[PDB]
Structure 1
């Protein structure tokens, strides 16, 4: 009978077996444990805001060789410290320190990208202005 029960009256066994074994799945385990709300820098949200604590030069993983130009950010809603990559040629000059920054994940649902070790967030906006707009000169940071 290749394992599983097949009786017309074995619905309880099959549904309980499925319940037990769905805990082996990553997504089901995370959702039912509420780990995004509980143990995650963003409390389950797509974006967050924080204050730049300091600029960092992160040495990329081998076989690459580069300084990846991240910032330490303290999130406003949590107080948790995160490291966020600052994406583009330059654009670390736009970030400075004590500026508010809008962070996002990068796309790997956690799981630090590429050759950047331990960095799982990227700066999208700084001082309410898009890094893309600052990098392409479409807009300027409000000095005062």
Structure 2
């Protein structure tokens, strides 16, 4: 089980901050690699220049051409 002593708060806090790295949301928001890899760079919107108009096939159960732009 877990420790319950009156002066185990250091161990409890250290264990929390050590185990908080084991869920994807906290790691994503606090490591910085996801923000670095994000093409928007942490912005809600971004402006760009259309390079090419391309079609993307939908997934397997569906059958359609999704119209996209390379930007």
**TM-score category, normalised to shorter length:** over 0.9
Match of 1:18 among 13, 16, 23: 16
Structure with higher strand content: 1
Q: State the Cα distance separating 1:62 from its structure 2 match.
A: 1.1
1: CA distance, partners of 2:30 / 2:12: 20
Match of 2:28 in 1: 30
Q: Which residue does the alignment assign to 1:57?
A: 55
Q: Deviations over 1:87-117 (max 9, x none)?
A: xxxxxxxxxxxxxxxxxxxxxxxxxxxxxxx
TM-score under structure 1 length normalisation: 0.47
SS in structure 1 at match of 2:29: helix
Higher helix share: 2
How does the TM-score come out when normalised to structure 2? Answer: 0.93
Gaps of 5+ in 2: none
CA distance in 2, matches of 1:17, 1:4: 11
Aligned-CA RMSD value: 1.0
Mapped to 1, the partners of 2:57 and 2:29 lie a distance apart of 34
Q: Is the 8 A contact 1:36 1:43 kept in 2?
A: no
Any stretches of 5+ residues in structure 1 without a counterpart? 74-144
